[PDB]
Amino acid sequence: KRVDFCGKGYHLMSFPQSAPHGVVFLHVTYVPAQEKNFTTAPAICHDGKAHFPREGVFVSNGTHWFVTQRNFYEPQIITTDNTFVSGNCDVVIGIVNNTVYDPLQPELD
């Protein structure tokens, strides 16, 4: 878990090999690439309440808002199960208006 102890980047494996008077390690590392640009926001205001992401980050491609994990781009529609509410949004800086879908209400119909 410590960074740069063995290998440059995130660590996956290692293999030991012998030498005449020493050892040789073949570390296996995982490195991201092919990045992009996006617009973020720390919280979502809806119905007077503030929704925060559970484990991830809010992103927007210009006209819609999704939640994605930190290390890989995989957009998902914001729901009421992957986001948690905490108080009312009147002191947080960076709030943006939006709507949050729920499955129970359409399910009951």
């Binding site: 960074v3 440059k8 980047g9 995130y10 490195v31 991201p32 690439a33 990045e35 973020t40 720390p42 919280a43 925060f52 980050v57 930190r70 905490s86 108080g87 002191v91 947080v92 800086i93 960076g94």
Partner: peptide, 29 residues
């Protein structure tokens, strides 16, 4: 661990608090 990636400072403090067990809700308020 690779190429530099831009990130706002507040969203980095949120991650650093979330790392040590304190929920990110504390920071933004």
């Amino acid at each position: 661990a690779g190429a530099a990636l831009q990130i706002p400072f507040a969203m980095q403090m949120a991650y650093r608090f979330n790392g040590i067990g304190v929920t990110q809700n504390v920071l933004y308020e």
